[PDB]
Amino acid sequence: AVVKCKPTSPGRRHVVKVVNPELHKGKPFAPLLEKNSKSGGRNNNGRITTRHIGGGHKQAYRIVDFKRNKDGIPAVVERLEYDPNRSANIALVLYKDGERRYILAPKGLKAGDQIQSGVDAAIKPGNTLPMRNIPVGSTVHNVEMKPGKGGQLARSAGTYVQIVARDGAYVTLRLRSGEMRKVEADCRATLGEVGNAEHMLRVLGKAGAARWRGVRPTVRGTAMNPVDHPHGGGEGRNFGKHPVTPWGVQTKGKKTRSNKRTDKFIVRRRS
Amino acid sequence: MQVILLDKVANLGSLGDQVNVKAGYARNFLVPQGKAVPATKKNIEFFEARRAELEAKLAEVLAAANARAEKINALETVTIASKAGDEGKLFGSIGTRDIADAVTAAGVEVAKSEVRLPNGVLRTTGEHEVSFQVHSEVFAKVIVNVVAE
Amino acid sequence: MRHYEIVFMVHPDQSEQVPGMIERYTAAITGAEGKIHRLEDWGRRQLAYPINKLHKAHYVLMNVEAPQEVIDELETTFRFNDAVIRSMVMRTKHAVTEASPMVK
Amino acid sequence: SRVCQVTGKRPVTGNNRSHALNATKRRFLPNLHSHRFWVESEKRFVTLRVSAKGMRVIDKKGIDTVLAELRARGEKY
RNA sequence: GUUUAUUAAAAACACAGCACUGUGCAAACACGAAAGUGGACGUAUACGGUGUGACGCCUGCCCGGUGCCGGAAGGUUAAU
Ligand SMILES: [Mg+2]
Ligand SMILES: [Mg+2]
Ligand SMILES: [Mg+2]
Ligand SMILES: [Mg+2]
Ligand SMILES: [Mg+2]
Ligand SMILES: [Mg+2]
Ligand SMILES: [Mg+2]
Ligand SMILES: [Mg+2]
Ligand SMILES: [Mg+2]
Ligand SMILES: [Mg+2]
Ligand SMILES: [Mg+2]
Ligand SMILES: [Mg+2]
Ligand SMILES: [Mg+2]
Ligand SMILES: [Mg+2]
């Protein structure tokens, strides 16, 4: 439910909230939190490695169960919660033996639905079962890449990965970027699309809304000086050269995939 | 790599042969598994004159235990119960340890790396052929039956 | 309740285990106080055209007077049972109990 | 560091003498590889960080010899 | 909002937004002779780069040059 806010002040003129009343308006489950220190984009040498990262609000890492190990114990969903750490909403679930965990929320998962991981699960959104047991053509998310490792594919707000084939030990996955990847069929994969699908509908509206998210201002390269960026300089707005990263490498179209360990798994590249 | 042999190998010859193989095949596979000795003239003395028939004895005390894991293991009534669904539909796959738990219990205490499988997963419930390679010369024709729960 | 006619097409290599399935669908129909009127195995029958890269299948007819909850529950079975190829949950007005023309 | 434990090969320095004979200092790195060697006199594997020349030495002197040379030299393995 | 502490506070930068593009995750990229680290305890609705700069109506033709992308037969071609 998106809400185009009203222009009481310039800066609210274009804010589009995404008001989900189903999210829990309280404190998160404290035994599944830990410290999540910021970095500013600064590695162990102290230098900025990744630019434009800083400030924002303090956050606490919700320990989300991606590996999803509780086989055959049926879980019920206690409530959906907001997660500042990611773009999808998370669901505090409650197993039969009393263990509470967080999972990513599927699309049709509401407060009170049941879920179950394992092999003998039911094929319906929320359940985690190995991809030699999910039918071909279904849409799954939170997909592993190695058996028992942890979900890594389709883990964002409103994404999903289809299972277009199954030939022996591999299944072919149409990824969300359009890329066809062979993953082992023993890799577990939760059914259904991941929940918060209208997350891409939001509009931040004002300059300091991205500052709340740890997104520092991004200076474009043609405004700099010829020592700073390759684009810099000129007596006016001059850009007589090809668009390169500040370290000199081409941007508009140069493919920088240098991994040859995993080219046997990639059936088709994206378009 | 002039290397001496301690057992018959695939495409080069039998015991007591001094074959020139590549260095990777001698170092990584043959020598650590005891199937070769790097042929020093002090080792040709250790082997070819002295232990020509003594190392030939040791290859023949192993074949007596090789034919014995065939003759008593002819029962082929191997019952392994696994959880499954219906008309096939297997919950948990049958590997090579799973076949080497019943034949270990009913037969010889054999390791897991001796089971030979064309399927490897063994999903469909029922009888399945399981060849054995307890040693690289003697084979068996055993069929393991998969039982549901 | 609502009279039905459910005919489905099992893979012919699974023909030896079709009466295993019958004893659970009919159990789920009578498990909801539901009548069954006829149940006629048509055997391995030659296809008119090869679906799923093969030419034969093992047809089963079954007339059913069930509630519509345990029929929608049954439609999800033929979806995720990989042995059955096609299914046809078809609705009829009255409980037809006279046998098929293709039993003779 | 890049030291073959068998032969003691060490990264020496040189020049990139171009076609116009310009000299820029370069390093000749050895062909080191971490490798496991089967020790029949202990029935186990020892992981030596050895150059590709050094594997030729082990296949000529025998592995049970060089591991005695490293004890007498004073380096763990 | 920010900016030349100390002759310039602007029409400059930023900005939300837009688009092209790279990147399947041991990601691309960056800091590092390396281990490693940031990215990110994130997973394409994600991240980096580049351009433009709310909004409204719009964004017309040109692939000859230079770039990048794909084609793999021929031609030429290095060490070996
Ligand atoms: Mg940035
Ligand atoms: Mg921007
Ligand atoms: Mg900018
Ligand atoms: Mg300037
Ligand atoms: Mg420059
Ligand atoms: Mg100008
Ligand atoms: Mg000009
Ligand atoms: Mg000089
Ligand atoms: Mg001033
Ligand atoms: Mg001033
Ligand atoms: Mg501008
Ligand atoms: Mg062109
Ligand atoms: Mg052209
Ligand atoms: Mg080209």
XYZ file of C-alpha atoms (C1' of nucleotides) and ligand atoms in Angstrom:
695
model
C 0.000 0.000 0.000
C 1.952 3.002 -1.283
C 1.096 6.463 0.022
C 1.881 9.518 -2.081
C 2.438 12.043 0.713
C 1.012 15.524 0.545
C 3.077 18.635 -0.331
C 2.991 20.373 3.015
C 6.640 21.348 2.500
C 8.991 20.993 -0.474
C 10.754 17.769 0.216
C 7.542 15.972 1.125
C 6.215 16.842 -2.347
C 7.469 13.619 -3.890
C 7.839 11.233 -0.932
C 6.091 7.921 -1.556
C 5.959 5.828 1.595
C 5.160 2.107 1.540
C 2.908 1.682 4.563
C 2.593 -1.933 5.620
C 0.311 -2.119 8.681
C 1.065 -5.825 9.111
C 4.583 -5.213 10.422
C 5.122 -5.492 14.154
C 5.212 -2.068 15.801
C 7.376 -3.086 18.715
C 10.843 -4.166 19.636
C 12.499 -7.086 17.822
C 13.223 -10.427 19.439
C 16.319 -9.540 21.492
C 17.999 -13.010 21.538
C 18.282 -12.773 17.739
C 20.127 -9.451 17.606
C 23.796 -8.592 17.813
C 26.084 -5.654 17.226
C 26.502 -4.617 13.596
C 29.181 -1.951 13.500
C 29.366 0.459 10.619
C 32.483 0.858 8.557
C 32.128 3.875 6.316
C 33.445 1.840 3.429
C 36.799 1.578 5.153
C 38.814 -1.642 5.259
C 41.476 -2.889 7.672
C 44.011 -0.515 6.123
C 41.656 2.324 6.997
C 41.368 3.557 3.405
C 38.040 4.034 1.686
C 37.593 1.041 -0.580
C 33.952 1.425 -1.510
C 32.892 5.001 -1.882
C 29.747 6.856 -0.832
C 29.028 4.930 2.379
C 28.667 6.643 5.711
C 26.519 7.971 8.496
C 22.995 6.687 8.467
C 21.145 5.321 11.433
C 22.520 2.773 13.856
C 21.339 -0.757 13.050
C 21.344 -4.121 14.802
C 21.880 -7.268 12.755
C 18.874 -9.579 12.893
C 20.245 -13.119 12.805
C 18.183 -14.500 9.928
C 18.240 -18.254 9.385
C 19.300 -18.619 5.758
C 20.589 -22.173 6.100
C 17.156 -23.344 7.305
C 18.118 -26.573 9.038
C 15.065 -27.571 11.134
C 13.884 -30.502 9.062
C 10.393 -31.857 9.601
C 9.611 -29.724 12.644
C 6.564 -27.664 11.634
C 6.850 -23.987 12.383
C 4.171 -21.359 12.821
C 4.800 -17.706 12.033
C 4.651 -15.450 15.064
C 4.824 -12.030 13.381
C 6.351 -10.222 10.437
C 8.927 -7.581 11.298
C 10.825 -4.773 9.642
C 14.499 -5.364 8.977
C 16.804 -2.363 8.499
C 19.539 -4.730 7.362
C 17.840 -5.753 4.129
C 15.038 -4.894 1.743
C 12.681 -7.787 2.465
C 10.624 -8.107 5.604
C 11.438 -10.877 8.038
C 9.187 -13.306 9.863
C 9.817 -14.403 13.425
C 8.711 -18.024 13.404
C 8.114 -20.404 16.283
C 8.900 -24.096 16.047
C 7.165 -26.826 18.023
C 10.078 -27.345 20.382
C 10.077 -23.649 21.321
C 12.961 -22.358 19.212
C 12.257 -18.967 17.692
C 14.028 -17.970 14.484
C 13.901 -15.298 11.817
C 13.358 -16.131 8.158
C 12.845 -14.034 5.081
C 9.160 -13.505 4.473
C 7.502 -14.988 1.392
C 4.754 -13.189 -0.478
C 1.730 -15.057 0.856
C 3.131 -15.468 4.373
C 1.096 -13.700 7.041
C 1.052 -13.787 10.820
C -0.131 -17.265 11.736
C 0.645 -19.344 8.649
C 2.579 -22.567 9.016
C 5.874 -23.539 7.448
C 8.173 -26.537 7.495
C 11.584 -27.375 6.081
C 12.904 -30.788 5.115
C 12.246 -33.271 2.318
C 8.752 -34.365 3.317
C 7.378 -30.813 3.270
C 4.307 -29.601 1.437
C 4.829 -27.692 -1.798
C 3.327 -24.291 -0.928
C 4.929 -20.876 -0.279
C 7.250 -20.685 2.709
C 8.596 -24.239 2.767
C 12.247 -25.147 2.244
C 12.954 -28.409 0.350
C 15.876 -29.608 -1.891
C 15.497 -28.809 -5.564
C 15.315 -32.442 -6.587
C 11.923 -32.358 -4.856
C 10.512 -29.048 -6.099
C 8.666 -29.332 -9.442
C 10.091 -27.884 -12.620
C 8.663 -24.458 -13.423
C 7.858 -23.307 -9.899
C 9.221 -20.036 -8.535
C 11.477 -20.317 -5.496
C 13.626 -17.899 -3.549
C 16.431 -17.946 -0.953
C 18.248 -20.518 -3.058
C 21.532 -22.123 -2.023
C 24.541 -22.592 -4.267
C 26.152 -25.434 -2.336
C 24.300 -28.123 -0.340
C 23.778 -27.003 3.227
C 25.652 -23.748 2.712
C 22.932 -21.128 3.002
C 20.495 -19.311 0.764
C 22.121 -16.852 -1.598
C 20.026 -16.506 -4.764
C 16.766 -14.500 -4.725
C 17.163 -13.009 -1.295
C 16.185 -9.391 -2.027
C 12.848 -7.638 -1.658
C 10.620 -8.973 -4.396
C 12.731 -11.456 -6.324
C 12.237 -15.068 -7.352
C 14.145 -17.728 -9.250
C 12.413 -20.228 -11.518
C 13.390 -23.873 -11.897
C 13.327 -24.395 -15.644
C 14.902 -27.860 -15.841
C 16.292 -30.812 -13.900
C 18.802 -33.132 -15.580
C 20.548 -35.521 -13.223
C 22.455 -33.866 -10.402
C 21.839 -30.318 -11.633
C 18.816 -28.083 -11.960
C 18.798 -25.054 -14.237
C 17.751 -21.816 -12.553
C 16.515 -18.799 -14.477
C 17.988 -16.126 -12.247
C 16.401 -12.738 -11.706
C 18.956 -11.095 -13.979
C 17.987 -13.528 -16.747
C 21.004 -15.786 -16.378
C 20.648 -19.559 -16.614
C 22.720 -21.269 -13.935
C 23.258 -24.933 -13.109
C 23.038 -25.585 -9.369
C 23.036 -28.985 -7.675
C 19.604 -30.390 -6.975
C 20.499 -31.087 -3.344
C 20.602 -27.352 -2.651
C 17.607 -26.380 -0.540
C 15.365 -23.586 -1.786
C 12.373 -21.914 -0.145
C 9.179 -21.815 -2.231
C 7.470 -18.661 -3.431
C 8.544 -15.100 -4.133
C 10.140 -13.185 -1.310
C 7.591 -10.882 0.256
C 8.121 -7.146 0.089
C 7.471 -6.857 -3.630
C 6.424 -3.198 -3.765
C 9.685 -2.046 -2.200
C 10.793 -0.737 -5.593
C 7.730 1.499 -5.697
C 8.999 3.747 -2.915
C 10.357 7.217 -3.592
C 12.662 8.798 -1.046
C 11.625 12.337 -1.862
C 14.339 14.422 -0.276
C 18.111 14.577 -0.168
C 18.523 13.542 3.427
C 16.448 10.421 3.077
C 19.335 8.669 1.366
C 21.586 10.171 4.026
C 19.607 8.199 6.597
C 20.489 5.031 4.713
C 24.258 5.362 4.759
C 24.378 6.666 1.203
C 26.773 9.590 1.142
C 26.626 12.118 -1.730
C 27.961 10.890 -5.060
C 30.083 13.446 -6.871
C 30.058 12.907 -10.600
C 33.349 12.704 -12.402
C 33.163 15.543 -14.873
C 32.940 18.099 -12.078
C 36.347 17.188 -10.724
C 39.836 18.354 -11.642
C 42.258 16.607 -14.036
C 44.231 15.254 -11.096
C 41.133 13.754 -9.409
C 39.075 11.962 -12.043
C 39.966 11.122 -15.639
C 36.867 13.082 -16.644
C 37.901 16.281 -14.973
C 38.826 19.639 -16.342
C 37.895 21.885 -19.196
C 36.993 25.551 -19.388
C 33.307 24.932 -18.950
C 31.498 21.625 -19.362
C 33.925 19.607 -21.494
C 33.766 15.808 -21.648
C 35.703 14.824 -24.724
C 36.611 11.295 -23.650
C 35.218 7.867 -23.053
C 33.395 7.141 -19.779
C 35.814 5.474 -17.381
C 35.837 4.625 -13.686
C 38.086 6.871 -11.538
C 40.734 4.132 -11.829
C 40.645 4.326 -15.605
C 38.661 1.253 -16.639
C 35.866 1.619 -19.232
C 32.273 1.701 -17.959
C 29.685 1.705 -20.748
C 29.782 -1.891 -21.780
C 33.156 -3.414 -20.953
C 32.507 -6.836 -19.461
C 34.587 -7.381 -16.342
C 33.799 -11.007 -15.552
C 37.160 -12.632 -14.910
C 35.987 -15.787 -13.130
C 36.762 -18.932 -15.086
C 36.179 -21.357 -12.241
C 32.412 -20.997 -12.641
C 31.813 -20.682 -16.362
C 30.753 -24.323 -16.639
C 27.729 -23.544 -14.453
C 26.505 -20.583 -16.501
C 24.257 -21.884 -19.256
C 23.395 -18.536 -20.822
C 24.493 -15.032 -19.962
C 21.899 -12.303 -19.562
C 20.754 -9.926 -22.281
C 60.589 -41.874 -14.181
C 61.995 -45.401 -13.998
C 59.786 -46.947 -11.330
C 59.339 -50.539 -10.174
C 55.905 -52.058 -9.548
C 54.401 -53.994 -6.649
C 51.117 -55.170 -8.269
C 49.689 -55.477 -11.760
C 48.466 -52.118 -13.069
C 46.216 -51.269 -16.041
C 48.152 -50.448 -19.197
C 51.829 -50.843 -18.294
C 52.463 -54.317 -16.897
C 52.478 -56.637 -13.921
C 54.476 -57.010 -10.707
C 58.230 -56.770 -11.097
C 58.235 -54.387 -14.048
C 60.444 -51.310 -14.385
C 58.231 -48.992 -16.428
C 58.935 -45.407 -17.472
C 55.782 -43.512 -16.525
C 55.220 -39.790 -16.238
C 56.223 -38.126 -12.981
C 52.704 -37.139 -11.952
C 51.396 -40.668 -12.295
C 54.227 -42.088 -10.211
C 54.269 -39.482 -7.445
C 50.571 -38.805 -6.867
C 48.851 -42.153 -7.427
C 51.148 -45.181 -7.558
C 53.694 -44.568 -4.768
C 51.281 -43.359 -1.991
C 48.957 -46.335 -2.524
C 51.854 -48.790 -2.305
C 51.617 -49.827 -5.945
C 55.178 -48.768 -6.838
C 58.680 -48.048 -5.523
C 60.996 -45.443 -7.142
C 63.545 -47.759 -8.699
C 66.886 -47.080 -7.098
C 69.565 -49.647 -7.881
C 69.602 -50.054 -4.090
C 65.890 -50.814 -4.482
C 66.433 -53.184 -7.421
C 68.709 -54.954 -4.940
C 65.937 -54.611 -2.354
C 63.369 -55.989 -4.811
C 64.486 -57.711 -8.005
C 67.129 -60.099 -6.639
C 65.922 -60.460 -3.040
C 62.146 -59.928 -2.951
C 61.200 -61.232 -6.405
C 59.188 -64.060 -4.828
C 58.700 -62.476 -1.398
C 56.786 -59.473 -2.721
C 55.105 -61.983 -5.040
C 54.000 -63.841 -1.904
C 52.322 -60.730 -0.423
C 50.273 -60.232 -3.587
C 48.953 -63.788 -3.131
C 48.004 -63.563 0.553
C 45.723 -60.693 -0.510
C 43.917 -62.667 -3.230
C 42.909 -65.324 -0.692
C 40.989 -62.658 1.239
C 39.748 -61.274 -2.091
C 37.986 -64.451 -3.237
C 36.578 -64.972 0.269
C 34.507 -61.753 0.267
C 32.699 -63.142 -2.815
C 31.785 -66.726 -1.905
C 30.140 -66.065 1.467
C 28.464 -62.883 0.175
C 26.027 -64.537 -2.237
C 22.877 -64.064 -0.143
C 21.581 -60.855 -1.858
C 18.808 -60.454 0.751
C 19.747 -56.896 1.696
C 16.858 -55.095 3.381
C 17.327 -51.373 4.023
C 14.321 -49.402 5.288
C 14.153 -45.714 4.357
C 11.487 -43.047 4.658
C 9.719 -42.361 1.357
C 6.469 -41.093 -0.106
C 4.337 -43.159 -2.470
C 5.051 -45.050 -5.732
C 8.681 -44.012 -5.608
C 9.069 -40.558 -3.999
C 12.092 -41.015 -1.777
C 12.678 -38.850 1.305
C 16.314 -39.736 1.938
C 18.742 -41.011 -0.682
C 20.715 -44.258 -0.475
C 24.423 -43.553 -0.888
C 27.419 -45.823 -0.502
C 27.643 -45.792 3.288
C 23.972 -46.800 3.295
C 24.760 -49.886 1.216
C 27.869 -50.432 3.366
C 25.803 -50.590 6.566
C 23.704 -53.699 5.861
C 26.374 -55.671 3.979
C 28.728 -54.582 6.768
C 26.194 -55.980 9.241
C 25.247 -58.996 7.066
C 28.500 -60.116 5.485
C 32.002 -58.671 5.800
C 32.994 -55.506 7.672
C 33.738 -53.523 4.492
C 34.477 -49.819 4.034
C 32.249 -47.337 2.220
C 34.639 -46.708 -0.704
C 34.068 -50.223 -2.091
C 30.509 -49.746 -3.407
C 30.076 -49.171 -7.154
C 26.912 -47.409 -8.277
C 25.606 -46.430 -11.722
C 22.866 -44.303 -10.101
C 24.491 -43.071 -6.884
C 21.301 -41.448 -5.560
C 19.046 -44.567 -5.730
C 15.766 -42.690 -5.525
C 13.181 -45.157 -6.853
C 12.080 -47.710 -4.256
C 12.887 -51.336 -5.006
C 15.713 -53.575 -6.100
C 18.861 -52.044 -7.579
C 22.100 -53.599 -8.828
C 25.181 -52.784 -6.722
C 28.535 -53.895 -8.062
C 31.478 -54.269 -5.692
C 35.138 -53.346 -6.087
C 36.611 -54.512 -2.767
C 39.824 -54.903 -4.791
C 40.593 -53.911 -8.385
C 40.611 -57.502 -9.733
C 37.602 -59.336 -8.241
C 34.016 -58.158 -8.791
C 30.612 -59.236 -7.481
C 27.000 -59.128 -8.701
C 24.860 -58.072 -5.718
C 21.426 -56.399 -5.831
C 20.210 -54.255 -2.911
C 16.474 -53.868 -2.255
C 15.134 -50.480 -1.123
C 12.244 -50.714 1.355
C 9.918 -47.839 2.228
C 8.639 -46.724 5.629
C -23.072 -32.539 -2.765
C -21.628 -31.699 -6.182
C -21.434 -34.615 -8.618
C -18.145 -35.003 -10.458
C -16.272 -37.158 -12.961
C -12.517 -37.415 -12.473
C -10.506 -39.214 -15.147
C -6.718 -39.279 -15.028
C -3.810 -40.706 -16.983
C -1.044 -42.559 -15.167
C 2.329 -43.254 -16.781
C 2.247 -46.830 -18.161
C 5.409 -47.903 -16.360
C 3.531 -47.024 -13.156
C 0.607 -49.285 -14.108
C 1.578 -51.955 -11.571
C 1.100 -49.457 -8.716
C -2.105 -47.731 -9.867
C -4.364 -49.746 -7.453
C -2.084 -48.460 -4.711
C -3.203 -44.917 -5.575
C -6.894 -45.851 -5.910
C -7.008 -46.965 -2.259
C -6.083 -43.411 -1.145
C -8.114 -41.193 -3.464
C -11.271 -43.212 -2.774
C -10.295 -43.176 0.896
C -10.058 -39.378 0.763
C -13.433 -39.155 -0.993
C -15.247 -41.403 1.469
C -13.223 -39.730 4.231
C -15.325 -36.604 3.671
C -18.660 -38.508 3.667
C -18.439 -38.636 -0.102
C -20.102 -41.135 -2.391
C -18.331 -43.003 -5.154
C -20.496 -44.266 -7.995
C -18.204 -46.030 -10.466
C -14.472 -46.709 -10.670
C -13.356 -48.384 -13.892
C -9.698 -49.023 -14.764
C -9.319 -48.818 -18.538
C -5.890 -50.459 -18.559
C -2.984 -49.570 -20.774
C -4.671 -47.610 -23.532
C -3.038 -46.401 -26.731
C -2.739 -42.632 -27.009
C -4.140 -40.879 -30.045
C -0.974 -38.736 -30.147
C 2.239 -38.869 -28.127
C 2.185 -36.662 -25.066
C 5.351 -36.506 -22.925
C 7.329 -38.481 -25.557
C 5.431 -41.770 -25.217
C 2.459 -43.545 -26.742
C 0.584 -45.386 -23.968
C -0.954 -44.619 -20.581
C -3.096 -46.267 -17.926
C -6.466 -44.557 -17.737
C -8.677 -44.517 -14.642
C -12.287 -43.286 -14.525
C -13.972 -42.429 -11.209
C -17.333 -40.783 -10.551
C -17.360 -38.899 -7.261
C -19.976 -37.060 -5.192
C -17.785 -35.176 -2.708
C -17.641 -31.736 -1.134
C -15.653 -29.297 -3.221
C -12.955 -28.885 -0.564
C -11.705 -32.478 -0.912
C -11.868 -32.166 -4.699
C -9.771 -29.002 -4.863
C -7.527 -30.897 -2.444
C -7.498 -33.718 -4.996
C -6.659 -31.407 -7.913
C -3.453 -30.460 -6.108
C -2.568 -34.151 -5.923
C -2.600 -34.650 -9.702
C -0.512 -31.497 -9.999
C 2.353 -32.762 -7.852
C 2.071 -36.504 -8.417
C 4.542 -37.007 -11.245
C 3.220 -40.466 -12.164
C -0.173 -39.216 -13.358
C 0.177 -37.266 -16.607
C -3.206 -35.638 -17.254
C -6.270 -35.292 -15.064
C -9.761 -34.056 -15.795
C -11.976 -32.991 -12.902
C -15.215 -32.631 -14.834
C -18.561 -31.686 -13.323
C -21.825 -33.517 -14.037
C -25.405 -32.826 -12.945
C -26.515 -36.265 -11.738
C -24.843 -39.310 -10.236
C -24.173 -41.526 -13.258
C -23.824 -45.121 -12.056
C -24.309 -46.997 -15.344
C -20.995 -48.331 -16.637
C -18.925 -46.897 -19.461
C -19.346 -47.655 -23.161
C -15.603 -48.380 -23.291
C -15.733 -51.157 -20.731
C -17.447 -53.395 -23.300
C 57.770 -15.892 2.477
C 58.508 -17.178 -1.037
C 61.190 -19.671 0.002
C 61.413 -23.184 -1.383
C 62.040 -25.296 1.668
C 64.028 -27.905 -0.263
C 66.354 -25.783 -2.391
C 66.176 -22.432 -0.629
C 65.172 -20.539 -3.745
C 64.472 -16.906 -3.002
C 63.053 -14.009 -5.076
C 66.054 -12.299 -6.623
C 65.769 -8.996 -8.457
C 66.652 -7.956 -11.982
C 65.532 -5.520 -14.659
C 62.922 -5.311 -17.390
C 65.443 -4.470 -20.085
C 63.221 -3.293 -22.905
C 64.065 -2.911 -26.577
C 65.468 0.565 -25.877
C 67.387 -0.970 -22.933
C 65.432 0.929 -20.282
C 65.836 -0.655 -16.867
C 62.964 -0.985 -14.423
C 63.561 -3.204 -11.409
C 61.591 -6.438 -11.423
C 61.552 -9.513 -9.225
C 62.152 -13.032 -10.416
C 59.753 -14.927 -8.241
C 60.349 -18.659 -7.762
C 57.859 -21.275 -8.895
C 56.630 -22.173 -5.431
C 53.742 -24.552 -4.866
C 52.262 -25.990 -1.698
C 52.338 -29.750 -2.145
C 51.712 -32.834 -0.006
C 54.286 -35.629 -0.152
C 53.599 -39.209 0.955
C 56.072 -40.259 3.636
C 56.151 -44.058 3.766
C 58.535 -43.903 6.731
C 55.747 -42.189 8.711
C 52.659 -43.324 6.696
C 51.382 -39.762 6.285
C 51.568 -36.629 4.157
C 53.815 -33.627 4.775
C 52.837 -30.294 3.232
C 56.005 -28.616 1.988
C 56.040 -25.239 0.295
C 58.355 -26.289 -2.492
C 59.411 -24.838 -5.827
C 59.025 -26.905 -8.999
C 62.775 -27.488 -9.081
C 62.466 -28.775 -5.536
C 60.003 -31.474 -6.533
C 62.585 -32.765 -9.005
C 65.027 -33.008 -6.099
C 62.610 -35.005 -3.944
C 61.990 -37.404 -6.819
C 65.774 -37.928 -7.112
C 67.008 -37.953 -3.512
C 63.881 -39.487 -2.059
C 61.440 -37.760 0.267
C 62.804 -39.507 3.377
C 66.181 -37.864 2.724
C 65.211 -34.196 2.326
C 63.051 -34.301 5.457
C 66.199 -35.307 7.316
C 68.064 -32.417 5.692
C 65.465 -29.976 7.007
C 65.816 -31.312 10.536
C 69.575 -30.831 10.301
C 69.013 -27.393 8.794
C 66.535 -26.352 11.473
C 63.185 -25.760 9.767
C 59.814 -27.265 10.667
C 57.675 -29.144 8.172
C 21.556 21.919 1.750
C 27.284 22.426 0.359
C 31.591 25.233 -1.317
C 37.397 28.189 -2.424
C 39.654 28.330 6.704
C 42.084 34.044 5.104
C 39.687 38.916 -1.895
C 34.499 34.416 -5.205
C 28.688 31.668 -1.418
C 27.164 31.791 -7.138
C 23.905 30.244 -12.186
C 29.167 26.101 -9.180
C 28.740 21.061 -6.205
C 25.035 18.144 -3.993
C 20.116 16.341 -4.201
C 15.595 13.187 -4.735
C 14.495 11.314 -9.459
C 16.060 9.309 -14.631
C 18.924 6.193 -17.827
C 22.765 3.491 -19.766
C 26.136 -0.061 -17.970
C 28.994 -3.657 -15.140
C 28.289 -7.525 -11.480
C 25.566 -15.016 -10.122
C 28.625 -13.907 -5.151
C 35.024 -16.634 -3.156
C 30.529 -10.893 -7.310
C 31.990 -6.465 -10.139
C 35.106 -2.872 -7.823
C 38.600 -0.907 -4.327
C 43.025 -1.025 -0.407
C 46.941 -4.141 -0.484
C 54.336 -7.331 -3.643
C 50.709 -11.352 -0.243
C 47.551 -13.087 3.620
C 43.574 -10.426 4.039
C 39.908 -6.548 4.306
C 35.896 -3.271 2.610
C 31.800 -4.503 -0.626
C 28.314 -7.162 2.879
C 27.420 -10.758 7.783
C 24.351 -7.648 1.772
C 22.501 -11.475 -3.050
C 20.072 -8.086 -9.294
C 13.748 -4.598 -6.054
C 21.246 -5.981 -4.534
C 26.038 -3.291 -5.351
C 29.684 -0.296 -8.199
C 30.670 3.162 -12.143
C 29.073 6.960 -15.638
C 25.853 10.823 -17.442
C 21.539 13.938 -16.553
C 19.263 16.554 -12.418
C 12.275 17.697 -8.795
C 7.937 18.370 -11.675
C 5.077 18.995 -16.510
C 5.057 18.205 -22.189
C 9.081 15.774 -24.415
C 14.010 13.399 -25.828
C 14.001 13.965 -33.705
C 18.064 11.669 -37.764
C 23.395 9.787 -38.254
C 27.414 3.543 -36.849
C 31.298 7.138 -41.745
C 35.622 8.342 -37.575
C 37.090 6.907 -32.651
C 35.377 3.392 -28.521
C 32.920 -0.850 -26.551
C 30.197 -5.542 -27.805
C 29.481 -10.127 -30.774
C 30.940 -13.292 -35.011
C 35.655 -17.298 -36.209
C 36.543 -19.125 -41.494
C 40.322 -16.810 -44.232
C 44.534 -13.513 -44.051
C 48.624 -11.920 -41.077
C 51.331 -13.080 -35.988
C 54.634 -13.857 -30.843
C 57.188 -17.170 -27.615
C 57.572 -22.333 -28.103
Mg 28.448 5.094 -4.841
Mg 22.894 9.429 -8.090
Mg 25.740 13.611 -8.684
Mg 35.868 22.238 -11.196
Mg 44.524 11.911 -16.150
Mg 32.709 25.119 -23.442
Mg 33.785 19.886 -28.600
Mg 68.458 4.097 -13.696
Mg 37.210 33.245 0.879
Mg 31.991 35.327 0.835
Mg 24.451 19.413 -14.516
Mg 31.151 2.421 -34.835
Mg 30.024 -0.791 -37.926
Mg 35.941 -8.563 -31.515
